[PDB]
Amino acid sequence: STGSATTTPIDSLDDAYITPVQIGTPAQTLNLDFDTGSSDLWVFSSETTASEVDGQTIYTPSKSTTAKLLSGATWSISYGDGSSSSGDVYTDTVSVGGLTVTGQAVESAKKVSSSFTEDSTIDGLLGLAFSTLNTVSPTQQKTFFDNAKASLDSPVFTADLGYHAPGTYNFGFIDTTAYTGSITYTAVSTKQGFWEWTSTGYAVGSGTFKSTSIDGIADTGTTLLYLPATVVSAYWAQVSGAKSSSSVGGYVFPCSATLPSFTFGVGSARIVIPGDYIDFGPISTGSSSCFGGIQSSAGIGINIFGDVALKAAFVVFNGATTPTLGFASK
C-alpha cells in the first residue's frame, strides 16, 4: 500500500503545516501537524476542556462505530517550545492520503496548553519519530508509520514541504518526479528516539564551505533551524544590523535586509536554503525589526533541522531495519 497527502502552511510565514487525516467511521477529518520530532497522535476532542477549545475541529469518539476506549491508558506530553497536552486514549481507524491503519492509538486531549488553544488551525499532532518516545502509559503505543510499515510497498515516508506553498507527505514510495538530481542518504541514530543524523558542514551565502560535524534531528514539527551558536553567529554576521536580542528571544535583523542563503552538508552533497526562507517577518505588527529563521540551539540541548531547512529539500525518512535519512534538492 501507499498514501499521499497534501500538507499546507497554516499562515503566511510557514509557521507549521497541516495535513488532513481521516479518523473513525464515518470519517472525521482533522487537520494535524505531522511531527517527525514526536511520537504521539493526539487530537482535540469532545473530551477537551471546553474553555481550551477555540475554533479547532474535534474528534468525537462516541460518533465513531470503530472507536474503542483503550482502557486505563493515559498520555501526557511536553514539547520543546513549552507547550503541552494530556488525556486518555482510543483506538480507531486512521487514514492518511488513502493509507489506512486499523487499531491506531488516537490520544484524546482532555487538556491542552494555551498555545494549542490559541492556534485554531491545528487540530492535533501526528507523531512520526520513533515509537520509543510515545507517551502512552502503562502500555506504550506505536506511531501511525510504525503501524503502517509492514503494509507499505517500501518502509519509508517522505516530506516535501513547500515555501509559502503546499507540499506533500508520501507513505510507502519515493516520487522520483519530486526532486532533482540524486538522493543522498546518511546514517541515523535512534538512541534518543529522533531522526538524528550528522550534517557534514555549512556555508553562508557564497562563502566557502566549512567542514564540521553537526549532529541534529530532522524535525518537521519545529518551524526554524536551530544550530550551534558559532554557526549562527557566522550567518548573522553577514547581515548588516542583525543582532541577538534577549528581549525578543533570538536573532533579529532589519526588515530592509536581503538575507544570504545558508547551505548545509549531507555527506558530500549540499542543500541550499535560500535567504528568503530565513525571513520570519516583523517581530510585532508594523515593526521594522524582523525575526530570523536560523537561531541558536545553545539553550535546547540539541540541534534541530526544522522546517526552514527541511523545506529546501525532498526528505526521505527510511524506516528500514537500519533507518536512514535521504536528502535531495528540488
From Swiss-Prot:
Reactions it catalyzes: Hydrolysis of proteins with specificity similar to that of pepsin A, prefers hydrophobic residues at P1 and P1', but does not cleave 14-Ala-|-Leu-15 in the B chain of insulin or Z-Glu-Tyr. Clots milk
| Keyword tags | Aspartyl protease, Disulfide bond, Hydrolase, Protease, Signal, Zymogen
Q: What's this protein's name?
A: Endothiapepsin
Location of the Peptidase A1 domain: 17-328
Q: Which gene encodes it?
A: EAPA
Species for this entry: Cryphonectria parasitica
Record EC number: 3.4.23.22
Which Gene Ontology terms describe the biological processes this protein takes part in?
proteolysis
Instruction: Note the SS bond partners.
Output: 255-290
Q: Which residues of the full protein are shown?
A: 90 to 419 of 419
Q: Which GO terms label this protein's molecular function in UniProt? A: aspartic-type endopeptidase activity
Could you read off the lineage of the organism from its UniProt record?
Eukaryota, Fungi, Dikarya, Ascomycota, Pezizomycotina
